[PDB]
């Protein structure tokens, strides 16, 4: 029984997904440069917020109030769902004051991970033309990224296989 209407923030939070996987040097370098430009060129009308915790657990048709109080000692009461649920309406609050907002979520890496949620945000893609370029770009950092280079590549082509639309 999907409602014909859904509640969404007034104006879209800006979520830009890294080419392979956030939290690493090569990916983090990609967004911070864009983070700098949006703050400088568009100063006084853009607010930047970082979502340190998870944001992929945005559910609306699970239960009336899972973990309403922290004294229930329930499995979900002491879990991280309570804080993630509280972070949803903060994005709503930033939207109502007419200033555009962005999301520095360090966990979501796919469009479908944050597509069915009530956020329905603007998705920005930064990608390299070929994986041949990406592997050498990773090499330009140093030996530290060589340990995680393997997991760095399967996380890249997965996003490419997602439809552009």
């Amino acid at each position: 029984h999907v409602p014909p209407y859904d509640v969404v923030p007034s104006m879209r939070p800006v979520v830009l997904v890294g080419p392979s996987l956030k939290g690493y040097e090569v990916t983090d370098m990609m967004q911070k440069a864009l983070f700098d430009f949006l703050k400088h060129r568009f100063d006084g009308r853009i607010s930047i917020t970082r979502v340190t915790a998870d944001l992929s657990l945005a559910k609306r048709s699970v239960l009336n109030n899972p973990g309403k109080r922290t004294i229930i000692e329930r499995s979900s009461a002491r879990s991280s769902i309570a804080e993630v649920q509280s972070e949803i309406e903060r994005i709503f609050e930033l939207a109502k004051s007419l200033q555009l907002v962005v999301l520095d979520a360090d966990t979501i890496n796919h469009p479908a991970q944050l597509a069915k949620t009530s956020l329905a945000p603007i998705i920005v893609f930064v990608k390299v033309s070929s994986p041949k370029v990406l592997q050498r770009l990773i090499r330009s950092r140093g030996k530290s990224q060589m340990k995680h280079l393997t997991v760095q590549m399967m996380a890249y082509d997965k996003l490419v296989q997602c439809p552009p639309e």
Binding site: V128, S129, S130, K132, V133, R136, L137
Partner: protein, 48 residues
């Protein structure tokens, strides 16, 4: 003697060699080598 001997034959030699080099470049083996050079330079431009 000089014009027919030295200059005319020089004209023929350059022409014949130029034609041979043109055909040599378009052999399948040479085309793949050039194609590799093109792709490597594109990667370098993209990486830069």
């Amino acid at each position: 003697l000089i014009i027919i001997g030295s200059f005319f034959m020089l004209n023929l030699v350059l022409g014949v060699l130029s034609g041979e080099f043109a055909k040599e470049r378009e052999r399948v083996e040479n085309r793949r080598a050039f194609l590799k050079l093109r792709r490597q330079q594109q990667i370098e431009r993209e990486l830069n």
